Paper text:
In summary, we have uncovered a unique [name] from the obligate intracellular pathogen [name] that is capable of efficiently cleaving long [name] chains of different linkages and binding [name] with extraordinary affinity.
To analyze the structural basis of the substrate preferences of [name], we assembled a complex of OtDUB1–259 with free [name] and determined the crystal structure of the complex at 2.2 Å resolution. Three [name] molecules bound to each [name] fragment. One [name] is bound to the active site (UbS1, gray) and represents the distal [name] that would remain after cleavage of the proximal [name] at the S1′ site (absent from the structure). The position of UbS1 in the [name] complex is rotated nearly 90° relative to the position of UbS1 in complexes with XopD and SdeA. Overall, UbS1 binding to [name] buries an extensive interface of nearly 1200 Å2, and results in modest conformational changes in [name] (overall RMSD < 1.5 Å) attributable mostly to a slight (~10°) rotation of VR-1 towards UbS1. We also observed the density for two additional [name] molecules: one bound to the side of the [name] that we propose represents the S2 site (pink), and a third [name] molecule (yellow) bound to the backside of VR-1 far from the active site, which likely represents the biochemically identified UBD. VR-1 folds into a compact helical bundle that presents two antiparallel helices for interaction with the canonical I44 surface patch of [name], the most common site for UBD interactions.
Residue numbers in the entry:
A (entry chain A): 1 to 259
B (entry chain B): 0 to 76
C (entry chain D), D (entry chain C): 1 to 76
Write the structure that this text describes.
């Protein structure tokens, strides 16, 4: 029972969160790359919205490129990436790791033609996955390569590298999940029953905390002063979790859980 | 004064009164106010991105009569 | 002087303007010639969003410059 | 006027200061009384990190305000 749900299992099906943590890890430091998280061809307004934002940003040079994990509405991921080609041409690169061509996707094509009739679409139509689980790993790999202007893995390369790219990507995911759950639990001890605190109440809650040693506090506060506590900003469970997941202090707590 | 729309998990579209300078956490609190959905259960999407607490609507170029989506997490093989 | 405004549909429109023309004025000329209301119009020059109360010369926009027009979705 | 500085060791230190005192001056007073060098000191008031060339009154720090002192690591 529930292989599809266990990260370690070879049958683990990637979620939008898995793909997003992986793309932000390999790409997120370059601001000129738009990373899409959630868009499915069964959401007609959201798909049109998404393509309009990205095509507008790329044609105007507000972004250089975009990577789009596109859900088929059918328990399946494909890779779409968009950049300027030669001569202010827009080039939409596509691969379904099943090797199924884009042509089926009349909704998708027509929505592109409506927004940008001059857009090129390069359907690589290359089979990659050798089972019904591995679309997530190949879509992550494909988008990274497409963003770098590198060719995607061939059928042969993909047959050979499938296990290694999942294993590599699942190593990063295991570590990332532990950093996030340690940061979340720390964020909870400091929010107590506030769903808002300022950076100023944070500083004071760390000082009064009854659990952390004086050295644990000194490390956490040094870690956060480096990039935060400048303008006394309002934090929530989510923004405080992300700020704490930034911390060497939290990354160390996670490091001991995993070894 | 600006209106935006939110499509909810039940398929209902609601209208929100907002400012461009409203924080995402403020928008999620307005959704909780009107529909009773807690912020931490909200997967709030504009044009394919999950909106992050500590950003504003204008950070995401969300303007008058924009539609946000409350979403279920996608997966596949 | 003349400037060009490119849309995502691939239409290029050519405008008669002065260096001292405001961004608002340029949007009003686009409404005049294309019928697109200013509040649907986002103007970009070389990757910067043009702000309504500034002039073409504030952005060093000269004869035969190309702007990019980003239109609001779905109608309007 | 008097201000207070809380340390992670649980010491509150009380300082004699003027509104016109620079942050650098406050760190020098902390070195004077506690022996901690200025370049190891990060001061916080109400969630804002105090910058060396500014004054207490720049940060609206008044009589009986509490600051937070954090010391740099032997590494980082």
């Amino acid at each position: 029972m529930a292989n599809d749900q266990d990260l370690s299992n070879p049958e683990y099906l990637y979620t939008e969160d898995d793909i997003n943590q992986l793309l932000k890890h390999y790409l997120g430091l370059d601001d000129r790359i738009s990373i899409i998280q959630h868009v499915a061809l069964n959401e007609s307004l959201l798909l049109k919205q998404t393509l309009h934002q990205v095509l507008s940003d790329i044609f105007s040079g507000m972004q250089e490129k975009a990577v789009i994990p596109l859900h088929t509405g059918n328990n399946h991921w494909v890779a779409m990436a968009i950049k300027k080609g030669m001569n202010d041409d827009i080039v939409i690169s596509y691969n379904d790791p099943m090797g199924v061509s884009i042509d089926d996707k009349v909704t998708l094509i027509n929505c592109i033609k409506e927004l940008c009739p001059g857009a090129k679409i390069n359907d690589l139509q290359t089979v990659q996955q050798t089972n019904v689980y591995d679309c997530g790993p190949f879509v992550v790999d494909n988008l990274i390569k497409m963003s770098q202007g590198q060719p995607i893995l061939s059928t042969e390369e993909a047959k050979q590298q499938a296990q290694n790219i999942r294993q590599s990507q699942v190593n990063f995911l295991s570590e990332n999940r532990m950093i996030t759950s340690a940061a979340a639990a720390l964020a909870d001890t400091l929010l107590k029953n506030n769903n808002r605190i300022t950076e100023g109440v944070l500083v004071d809650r760390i000082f009064d905390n009854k659990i952390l040693s004086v050295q644990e506090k000194q490390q956490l506060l040094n870690n956060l002063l480096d990039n935060h506590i400048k303008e006394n900003k309002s934090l929530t469970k989510e923004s405080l979790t992300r700020m704490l997941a930034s911390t060497h202090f939290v990354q160390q707590q996670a490091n001991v859980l995993l070894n | 004064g600006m209106q935006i729309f939110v499509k909810t998990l039940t398929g209902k579209t609601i209208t929100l009164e907002v400012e461009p300078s409203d924080t995402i956490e403020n928008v999620k609190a307005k959704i909780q106010d009107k529909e009773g959905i807690p912020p931490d259960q909200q997967r709030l999407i504009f044009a394919g991105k999950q909106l992050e607490d500590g950003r504003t609507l204008s950070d995401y170029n969300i303007q008058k009569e924009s539609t946000l989506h409350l979403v279920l997490r996608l997966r596949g093989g």
